[PDB]
Amino acid sequence: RFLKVKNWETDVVLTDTLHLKSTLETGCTEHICMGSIMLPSVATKDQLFPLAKEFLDQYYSSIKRFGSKAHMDRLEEVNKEIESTSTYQLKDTELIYGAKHAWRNASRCVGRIQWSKLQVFDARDCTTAHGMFNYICNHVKYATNKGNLRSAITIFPQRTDGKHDFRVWNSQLIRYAGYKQPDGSTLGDPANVQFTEICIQQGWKAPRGRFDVLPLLLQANGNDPELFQIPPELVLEVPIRHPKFDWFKDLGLKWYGLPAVSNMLLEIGGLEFSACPFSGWYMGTEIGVRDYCDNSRYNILEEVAKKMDLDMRKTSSLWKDQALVEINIAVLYSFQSDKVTIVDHHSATESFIKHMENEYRCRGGCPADWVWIVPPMSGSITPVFFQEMLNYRLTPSFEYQPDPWNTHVW
Amino acid sequence: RFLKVKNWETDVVLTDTLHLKSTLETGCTEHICMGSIMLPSVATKDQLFPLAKEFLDQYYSSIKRFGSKAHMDRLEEVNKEIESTSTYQLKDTELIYGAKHAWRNASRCVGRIQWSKLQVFDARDCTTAHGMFNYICNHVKYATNKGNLRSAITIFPQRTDGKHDFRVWNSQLIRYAGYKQPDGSTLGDPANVQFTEICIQQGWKAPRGRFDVLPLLLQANGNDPELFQIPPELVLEVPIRHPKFDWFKDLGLKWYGLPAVSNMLLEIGGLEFSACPFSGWYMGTEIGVRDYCDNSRYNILEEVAKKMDLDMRKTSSLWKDQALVEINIAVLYSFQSDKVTIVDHHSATESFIKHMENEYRCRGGCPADWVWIVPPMSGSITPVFFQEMLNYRLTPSFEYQPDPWNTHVW
Ligand code: HEM
Ligand code: HEM
Ligand SMILES: CNCc1cccc(-c2cc(C)cc(N)n2)c1
Ligand SMILES: CNCc1cccc(-c2cc(C)cc(N)n2)c1
Ligand SMILES: C[C@H](O)[C@H](O)[C@H]1CNc2nc(N)[nH]c(=O)c2N1
Ligand SMILES: C[C@H](O)[C@H](O)[C@H]1CNc2nc(N)[nH]c(=O)c2N1
Ligand SMILES: [Zn+2]
């Protein structure tokens, strides 16, 4: 009941007991392993105080006042407000703790060494899609910090009944538009073409280029969402050059500095925050491997390998592999020559192993998803390839949620 | 109870019901996922007929004579021999079926599209370490076929009591020697230095170079094993050159053509074959990524990147990534210019997706381990990165077993 994870590059072993505190199910049974399925699958007051009890107990058991009366009066206070209103509200300190631990428990995140250094923006007083748009601009500006990126989350009012829900309809706050062409093909980002249509549907005026920043579709208190365009001076973008190849400029590629996921749900003490955009900084491979070279994304390996003049008749020339390394040299180089925060997959996996140690020491475990932790290129020349990870679901936590245009009573 | 796996590069879905036939446990519980732990953990007659029953039932239910009397008389025959001798013996046809399906059920193997085209060598009449050495040479020679590699397995007598056990002590039939140096460092293959010591211990006369083929340590009928050196004319080796870089020859690297794992256990109908060397042909990355660039293996990225004159001050130059692609271009090129069978990680992952279709159609499922199927470089520019796989344990099956120098009553 006190399981062991081994590292095979180092022969180092650690003991996981943190998984005893786990609660939610994983998809795996004693006779089936779902570790590579992407997404496996009102809340009453009878269930809401147990979750409120569990959260608050570890929150006072973090500030070395577990079991005190300051704890007990807080437990009694939440208990009775869960009688009165049936729901409850978190303290400022309980929200900052809960948010930082949702990140800390996010087993699919390799950059979690930074989990404590997070800036929480309490937007629970927000009421309008314009108020949402204000909070979100202030997040963008702060989290960007002139390229010296800082991580942050903005927490909008929690779900109450179920109809009245704050939702950022964008998947990330900043993404490039996606238009399918009359000739069947696709301009911009193909992942967003469904979204982009809903944007033009709500009256967006598309510039119809490659790297068009989408507007925000912000839904406030269950209301029909409204389009707002982040001021372009707030959207920091990096033009992508290669430090050897001058033809690389003519590829005319760029990316935005700020990775800010907006479509997930923040669970704290049984409360559900449907709108909780959180931002850090990019690991190089997300842009240079996935965004740029996924077949159903920008799919640029074709053209990069051309300009390198590569043996493209043969699958086995590793022409694909060769153009993939140059592209991530170009992402990295470009972001750093502009002083915009980016981390390479070597230094990020190293930090994660480093983070993983401290978690097994001063916490007794680190939930971790190998399928997601291993970078999508050069897997085994990074140290996380050789690290056995235990995946389990701790709380507070970030969760996926449905897209709102497929659930909203419109 | 009829689960679904999605592919996200193609939006294609398949339905797994084959997992209903699963039997063994995985390490994962409803609340913990062990998908990245490498190895999670006499047989009586009360348990041995159920396993014999299950096997034979699907074996006649493969040749469209399920439930017939030819089946029933075979079930009665095994039943009564399990009374008489308590164990039993497989027909030739039952051994070839059982062996091909152990391969077919091997969820960690990406080359399983070939599972049916397997050559079974019945060495169950073998009695001596010299007889083992003969069968194994005939396997090497056949499976190699002048470089036109053919896949094969040699099945030595099954475990009976437990003391009398046929074991190939080598991990693979052909591996390079491993000597640690007086200066702390290591020559050859560091993975084998423990083995190499046991070989010199049993009186091996080490040439003490880099690429020294080890001898065979073959244990027959539980006896203390004996050293035999495969005739070098039978060991086909590929010198590694690059199709651009002439300095690559001076690296003086080579590899052997035949991947032949010798240390696993073949379970068929509850019978355990402790010696069952099986061989195919290499996927390029095993040599060019793992063998050559694992830190605890040949660790050549250092020197390759030197000769390329690479920015090696910075982790973020992807100098490691860059020398890794050239090395697998050199493995591939060298093996094919010599007409020795090798497959590149692109064409092998494609075939596996291709194999995966047919399994879900004419069988209803394909046990598959994503952690192992995804090649250890360029993961997401191959199609298996985007394929959800269900891992589960079907039988017949290949299993790991202890090393014999850590279990043998010597
Ligand atoms: C310090 C900078 C950060 C880095 C370098 C980083 C790194 C990464 C990477 C590479 C991924 C994989 C994304 C993908 O493959 O689609 C990821 C996912 C994730 N990150 Fe982190 N991240 C950072 C900050 C944050 C913050 C600030 C939060 C939350 C407050 C967070 C929570 C998550 C979660 C929940 C996921 C998984 C979401 C999903 O399953 O799609 N990360 N991160
Ligand atoms: C057709 C040529 C074959 C190819 C291209 C191939 C490919 C591979 C690869 C790349 C691996 C991963 C090895 C590692 O990472 O250490 C593997 C493992 C494995 N292969 Fe296949 N293989 C072939 C033939 C065979 C045969 C003939 C058998 C059995 C009769 C087999 C059964 C297995 C098993 C059981 C494993 C996993 C063993 C372990 O967990 O260490 N394969 N294969
Ligand atoms: C399924 N995609 C989720 C997703 C998509 C895109 C980016 C991220 C991300 C988020 C943060 C905070 C940091 C980072 N380096 N990347 C996450
Ligand atoms: C834990 N290592 C197992 C291992 C190590 C080395 C090679 C293989 C292998 C075996 C076969 C038959 C084909 C292939 N392409 N590779 C398997
Ligand atoms: C810790 C981790 O499970 C370990 O590195 C695994 C990961 N996947 C692998 N995949 C293959 N094909 N071969 C391996 O040796 C490994 N090693
Ligand atoms: C099918 C498979 O689970 C899917 O491709 C996963 C694999 N691992 C991943 N890992 C990361 N970091 N991001 C991803 O989108 C994925 N996709
Ligand atoms: Zn699992």
The structural domains of chain B, with segments of one domain joined by +, span 16-124+151-161+265-279+349-373, 125-150+165-236+400-404, 237-259+282-347
Q: What is the dihedral of CA B397, B401, B404, B408, to 10 degrees?
A: -100
One-letter amino acid at A176 equals Y
Residue B281 labeled ligand binder: yes
One-letter amino acid at B349 equals T
Count Cβ atoms within 10 A of the Cβ of residue A5 and give its class: 0-12 exposed, 13-18 middle, 19 or more buried. buried
Kindly report the backbone phi and psi dihedral angles of residue A84, in degrees, each rounded to the nearest multiple of 5, phi listed first: -60, -70
Q: Does A265 sit in the ligand 1 pocket, CB within 6 Å?
A: no
Q: Does B281 sit in the ligand 2 pocket, CB within 6 Å?
A: yes
Q: Are A315 and B336 in contact (CB under 8 A)?
A: no
Q: Are A110 and A348 in contact (CB under 8 A)?
A: yes
Rounded to whole angstroms, how far apart are CA atoms B374 and A151? 31
Query: Binding site for L-arginine: residue ranges of A?
Result: 172, 281-282, 286
B94, B104, B109, B167: which one is catalytic? B109
Enumerate helices (H) and strands (E) in chain B, giving the number of each: 12, 18
Q: Are B332 and B293 in contact (CB under 8 A)?
A: no
Bridge partners (DSSP) listed for residue B188: B178
Rounded to whole angstroms, how far apart are CA atoms B410 and B404? 10
Atom 5 of ligand 6, nearest CA residue: B386
- The CB density around residue B28, as the number of other CB atoms within 10 Å, is 24
Count Cβ atoms within 10 A of the Cβ of residue B379 and give its class: 0-12 exposed, 13-18 middle, 19 or more buried. buried
Q: What distance in angstroms lies between residue B239's CA and the mean position of ligand 4's atoms? A: 20
* H or E stretch at A15: strand A13-15
Q: A293 CB near a chain B CB, below 8 Å?
A: yes
Contacts of B69 (CB under 8 A, 6+ apart): none
Q: What distance in angstroms lies between residue B9's CA and the mean position of ligand 6's atoms? A: 11
One-letter amino acid at B250 equals D
Look at B321 and A26 and tell me if their CB atoms are within 8 Å.
no
Ligand closest to Cα of A396 equals 1
Count Cβ atoms within 10 A of the Cβ of residue A271 and give its class: 0-12 exposed, 13-18 middle, 19 or more buried. buried
Across A75-163, where does the E strand assignment appear? 119-122, 152-155
One-letter amino acid at A156 equals F
From B164's Cα to the closest Cα of chain A, the distance in A is 32
Kindly report the backbone phi and psi dihedral angles of residue B220, in degrees, each rounded to the nearest multiple of 5, phi listed first: -115, 130
Q: Are A316 and A84 in contact (CB under 8 A)?
A: no
From B299's Cα to the closest Cα of chain A, the distance in A is 10
Strands B260-261 and B278-279: antiparallel
Look at B381 and A289 and tell me if their CB atoms are within 8 Å.
yes
- Residue whose entry in the numeric block shows the structure tokens 């997300």: A286
Bridge partners (DSSP) listed for residue A238: A255
Q: Which bin fits B221, alpha (ψ -120 to 50), beta or left (φ > 0)?
A: left
Q: Are A140 and A152 in contact (CB under 8 A)?
A: no
User: What are the Cα distances from residue A212, in Å, to B56, B135, B300?
Assistant: 63, 67, 44
Rounded to whole angstroms, how far apart are CA atoms B83 and B98? 22
Ligand closest to Cα of A189 equals 3
Instruction: Give the technique used to solve this structure.
Output: X-ray
Across A233-366, where does the E strand assignment appear? 237-239, 254-256, 260-261, 264-268, 271-273, 278-279, 282-283, 342-343
- The CB density around residue A265, as the number of other CB atoms within 10 Å, is 18
Which of A290, A260, A293 is closest to A277 using CA atoms? Answer: A260
Tokens of A203: 């009256």
Rounded to whole angstroms, how far apart are CA atoms B188 and A292? 40
* H or E stretch at A361: helix A345-362
Residue B385 labeled ligand binder: yes
Kindly report the backbone phi and psi dihedral angles of residue A68, in degrees, each rounded to the nearest multiple of 5, phi listed first: -65, 175
Helices marked H in A17-68 — which ranges? Answer: 45-60
Interface of A with B in 357-386 (CB under 8 A): 369-371, 374-381, 385
Kindly report the backbone phi and psi dihedral angles of residue B17, in degrees, each rounded to the nearest multiple of 5, phi listed first: -115, -10
> Ligand 5 pocket test: which of B282, B372, B382 has the largest number of ligand atoms within 8 Å of its C-beta?
B372
Counting every residue written for chain B, the total comes to 410
Q: Are A112 and A106 in contact (CB under 8 A)?
A: yes
Tokens of A45: 């007051």
Ligand closest to Cα of A172 equals 3
Q: B250 CB near a chain A CB, below 8 Å?
A: no
Long-range Cβ pairs for the range B225-231 (8 Å, 24+): B225/B129, B225/B167, B225/B169, B225/B404, B226/B129, B226/B130, B226/B202, B227/B199, B227/B202, B227/B203, B228/B129, B228/B130, B228/B133, B230/B136, B230/B137, B230/B140, B230/B173, B230/B174, B231/B137
Which of A409, A152, A372, A130 is closest to A262 using CA atoms? Answer: A152
- Residue whose entry in the numeric block shows the structure tokens 């013996």: B89
Atom 36 of ligand 2, nearest CA residue: B109
DSSP state, residue A64: T
Q: What distance in angstroms lies between residue A5's CA and the mean position of ligand 5's atoms? A: 13
- Residue whose entry in the numeric block shows the structure tokens 């090798």: B342
Q: B70 CB near a chain A CB, below 8 Å?
A: no
Rounded to whole angstroms, how far apart are CA atoms A342 and A285? 10
Q: B344 CB near a chain A CB, below 8 Å?
A: yes
Q: Does B265 sit in the ligand 2 pocket, CB within 6 Å?
A: no
Q: Are A8 and A386 in contact (CB under 8 A)?
A: yes
Rounded to whole angstroms, how far apart are CA atoms B152 and B140? 9
- The CB density around residue A134, as the number of other CB atoms within 10 Å, is 14
Rounded to whole angstroms, how far apart are CA atoms A104 and B180? 42
Contacts of A105 (CB under 8 A, 6+ apart): A367, A393, A394, A395, A396, A397
Q: Are B179 and B208 in contact (CB under 8 A)?
A: yes
Which of A10, A1, A33, A40 is closest to A356 using CA atoms? Answer: A10
Atom 15 of ligand 3, nearest CA residue: A282
Rounded to whole angstroms, how far apart are CA atoms B373 and B110? 6
Tokens of B117: 């085209």
Rounded to whole angstroms, how far apart are CA atoms A394 and A24? 7
DSSP state, residue B287: I
Question: What is the SS3 assignment for B52?
Answer: helix
Q: Is the dihedral of CA B90, B91, B96, B97 positive or negative?
A: negative
- The CB density around residue A303, as the number of other CB atoms within 10 Å, is 13
Which of B131, B58, B53 is closest to B100 using CA atoms? Answer: B58
One-letter amino acid at A305 equals A
Q: What distance in angstroms lies between residue A106's CA and the mean position of ligand 1's atoms? A: 8
Peptide bond into B396 cis (omega under 30): yes
Rounded to whole angstroms, how far apart are CA atoms B285 and B292? 9
Tokens of A31: 């006779």
User: What are the Cα distances from residue B47, in Å, to A106, A175, B20, B91?
Assistant: 43, 59, 21, 20
Rounded to whole angstroms, how far apart are CA atoms B214 and B358? 40
Q: How many CA atoms lie within 13 A of B400 on its CB side?
A: 7
Q: Which of A10, A19, A33 to mutate to test the interface with B (most CBs of B within 10 A)?
A: A33
Rounded to whole angstroms, how far apart are CA atoms A42 and B204? 73
Rounded to whole angstroms, how far apart are CA atoms A291 and A300? 9
Bridge partners (DSSP) listed for residue A29: A32
Report the Cα A284 to chain-centroid distance in Å: 15
Kindly report the backbone phi and psi dihedral angles of residue A268, in degrees, each rounded to the nearest multiple of 5, phi listed first: -135, 125
Q: Catalytic: B281?
A: yes
From A122's Cα to the closest Cα of chain B, the distance in A is 32
Rounded to whole angstroms, how far apart are CA atoms A331 and A327? 6
Tokens of B134: 């003969």
One-letter amino acid at B247 equals W
Question: What is the SS3 assignment for A254?
Answer: strand
Chain breaks in chain A (C to N over 2.5 A) after: 41
Query: Binding site: residue ranges of A?
Result: 36, 109, 172, 281-282, 286, 371-372, 385, 400
Residues of chain A with Cβ-Cβ distance to B385 below 8 Å are 376
Residues of chain A with Cβ-Cβ distance to B30 below 8 Å are 25-26, 28-30
Atom 10 of ligand 6, nearest CA residue: A372
Exposure string over B80-105, b if 16+ CB within 10 A, otherwise e: eebeeeebbebeeebbbbbbbbbbbb
Alpha-carbon radius of gyration of chain A:
23
Q: Which of B10, B14, B30, B32 to mutate to test the interface with A (most CBs of A within 10 A)?
A: B32
Nearest-10 crossing angle of helices A319-337, B319-337: 170
Q: Does B372 sit in the ligand 5 pocket, CB within 6 Å?
A: yes
Look at B30 and A29 and tell me if their CB atoms are within 8 Å.
yes
- Chain A: residue whose CA lies nearest to B384: A36
Which of B159, B111, B119, B117 is closest to B135 using CA atoms? Answer: B119
Q: Are A123 and A156 in contact (CB under 8 A)?
A: yes
Rounded to whole angstroms, how far apart are CA atoms A22 and A343? 31
CA angle, A116 as apex, A111 and A122 as ends, to 5°? Answer: 110
> Ligand 1 pocket test: which of A108, A267, A342, A374 has the largest number of ligand atoms within 8 Å of its C-beta?
A108
From A380's Cα to the closest Cα of chain B, the distance in A is 5
